[PDB]
């Protein structure tokens, strides 16, 4: 799961979707090009998305990635500098631990806080 952790970390901290093998939870359509629609591959999800907290976590991940991609596309930059927020995210170096319990919920919560901070900074100032 190391490469999957890499993809998830990228989607959670920079909104980048490098998914050449159709694996990640979500993906952009449309391969002018800004009215993008996201989908969610239900089959490849990590949590079954049946209860309410699992759906909350899933959509928090999706929204974190979406907001970070928006921020990154507006500034015409290829990546968001790590100093753009005081909430810094570490890499996922143990997938089993991350999926143990509420660990994934806190990880996605930190990523969502950083994403919302940067997105609101960008909109309300730039």
């Amino acid at each position: 799961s190391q490469d999957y952790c890499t993809m998830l970390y990228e989607w959670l901290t920079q909104g980048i979707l490098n998914d050449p093998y159709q694996e990640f939870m979500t993906y952009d359509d449309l391969e002018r090009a800004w009215d993008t629609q996201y989908f969610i591959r239900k089959d490849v999800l990590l949590r079954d998305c049946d209860s309410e907290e699992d759906k909350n976590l899933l959509f928090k991940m999706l929204r974190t990635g979406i907001l970070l991609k928006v921020v990154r596309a507006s500034l015409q930059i290829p990546t968001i500098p790590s100093n753009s927020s005081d909430i810094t995210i570490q890499e996922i170096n143990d997938f089993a631990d991350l999926m143990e319990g509420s660990n994934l919920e806190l990880y996605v919560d930190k990523c969502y806080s950083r994403a919302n901070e940067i997105f609101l900074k960008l909109f309300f100032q730039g």
């Binding site: 319990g101 509420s102 660990n103 919920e105 806190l106 919560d109």
Partner: protein, 84 residues
């Protein structure tokens, strides 16, 4: 050693995962229409007849209460960061 793993799971995560009825704390989602959604219940029972003879009933109640309080804080008080 594996019973200690049971206890460790219950005391640090509120988990009754794969105990097969060997633990003195069983998840009890069996209700009779009263609190179908566990607004008042925390559906977990504590059988005093299953406490092993090498655990004092006081420490067994303390274990039950530690697990119940962890599940409480994490699910109803939404205290996720502190519980983690």
């Amino acid at each position: 050693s594996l019973y200690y793993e049971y206890l460790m799971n219950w005391l640090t995560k509120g988990l009754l995962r794969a105990t097969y009825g060997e633990f003195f704390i069983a998840e009890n989602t069996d209700t009779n229409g009263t609190d179908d959604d566990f607004i008042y219940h925390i559906p977990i029972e504590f059988n005093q007849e299953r406490v092993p003879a090498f655990i004092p009933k006081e420490l067994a109640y303390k274990i039950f209460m530690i697990g119940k309080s962890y599940i409480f804080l994490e699910k109803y008080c939404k205290e996720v960061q502190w519980t983690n």
